[PDB]
Design a protein around this ligand. Structure first.
Ligand SMILES: CN1C(=N)N[C@](CCC2CCCCC2)(CC2CCCCC2)C1=O
Length: 390
């Protein structure tokens, strides 16, 4: 592991997000920032909010520059509005550099800030094409690379604990690593396998085959990428296109049929609980997603366990039972490989080579009988037809 200064620099959990410490302004103002590979704006709370105990104070920064421009960003579950400007930004447990970056000072929001998440802003790590108001607002990572010698690459190890973390525990626990400018080999086991970034906007990829316990879901592969497939640390669940979700849940129900679960469980709304330590992991199937490889007609697969797709939640009774929510849900906007999937892998966002790498995570939760996996190669034909075109 050659990047010790950045190892273990993340905190958080799949449901409320993983964050990294950053500083903004002169003198430096410390803020916890959500790592979001599914957006492209660096936006931080800049005004009092019930869920914030600190925020960016522009008037206290001598290096603050006002862009005299507003920004409005509505999203599925909510929205954030702010004022654009630039200032000096650093990552304490990151590369030893300071860069001038765009910052959206959030002045109004709805369903953005999460009570108790311990973060005050978000770091959009995707491409300028999806930056708001438009692609002229240079994303933080683009600025970082343009202004320093930092390699155009970052890697994420998100570490799920495998059990509920109370408020005190989640603040004291290491939630993972964000390695800026490199790959730290202590964070994964086995080999790294790369899939092409199809297009530079979201981190878009192409899924070419899906298996539930080795059983082919057997759908036209274009269904798996309708209308796109992305890797998004800012989404909790593995989200699947409606038709794929329907087929996958049918297959997961069949594999786990020795136990009947309520409709609310499958809808990802209600938790299911087992006596302490008795979670029947073995009745649940592993899920394999085959991804396009970098070699013509070659693919590889990533396999996750129910320890990834069943998300640990505290029982409404704080009892001693082990409880979970089903973290696979439907989407009308394509496949989203969210945090619960990323928790099984060390994921390399190799922007320089326009590819995303996957390897088994040194911190993935498993049992004595099964482990997550990244395996290849497999001969796979016509993978280009798996990509969706509007
Ligand atoms: C899922 N998702 C995401 N990964 N980022 C956003 C915005 C997505 C962008 C995508 C491009 C267009 C503008 C919105 C924000 C949320 C992230 C978690 C914390 C609450 C807000 C979102 O809705």
């Amino acid at each position: 592991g050659s990047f010790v200064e950045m190892v273990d620099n993340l905190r958080g959990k799949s449901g409320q997000g993983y964050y990294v410490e950053m500083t903004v302004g002169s003198p430096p103002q410390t803020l916890n920032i959500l790592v979001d590979t599914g957006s492209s704006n660096f936006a931080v709370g800049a005004a009092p909010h019930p869920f914030l105990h600190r925020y960016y104070q522009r008037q206290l920064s001598s290096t603050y520059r006002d862009l005299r421009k507003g920004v409005y960003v509505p999203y599925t579950q909510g929205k954030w509005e702010g004022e654009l400007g630039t200032d000096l930004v650093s990552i304490p447990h990151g590369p030893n550099v300071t860069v001038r970056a765009n910052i959206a000072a959030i002045t109004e929001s709805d369903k953005f800030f999460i009570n108790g998440s311990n973060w005050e802003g978000i770091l959009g790590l995707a491409y300028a094409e999806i930056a708001r108001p438009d692609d002229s607002l240079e994303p933080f990572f683009d600025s970082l690379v343009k202004q320093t010698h930092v390699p155009n690459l970052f890697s994420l190890q998100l570490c799920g604990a495998g059990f509920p973390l109370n408020q005190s525990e989640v603040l004291a626990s290491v939630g993972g690593s964000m390695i800026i400018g490199g790959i730290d080999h202590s964070l994964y086991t086995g080999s790294l396998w790369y899939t092409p970034i199809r297009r530079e906007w979201y981190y878009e990829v192409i899924i070419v085959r899906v298996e539930i316990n080795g059983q082919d879901l057997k759908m036209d592969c274009k269904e798996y990428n309708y209308d796109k497939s992305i890797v998004d640390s800012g989404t909790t669940n593995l989200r699947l296109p409606k038709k794929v979700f329907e087929a996958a849940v049918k297959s997961i129900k069949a594999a786990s049929s020795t136990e009947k679960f309520p409709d609310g469980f499958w809808l990802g709304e209600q938790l299911v609980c087992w006596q302490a330590g008795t979670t029947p992991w073995n009745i649940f199937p592993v899920i394999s997603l085959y991804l396009m490889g970098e070699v013509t007609n070659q693919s590889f697969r990533i396999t996750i366990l129910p320890q990834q797709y069943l998300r640990p939640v505290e029982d409404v009774a704080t009892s001693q039972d082990d409880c979970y929510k089903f973290a696979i849900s439907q989407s009308s906007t394509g496949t989203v490989m969210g945090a619960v999937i990323m928790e099984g892998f060390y994921v390399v966002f190799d922007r320089a080579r326009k590819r995303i790498g996957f390897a088994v995570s040194a911190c993935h939760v498993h049992d004595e009988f099964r482990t997550a996996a990244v395996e290849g190669p497999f001969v796979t034909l016509d993978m280009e037809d798996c990509g969706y075109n509007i």
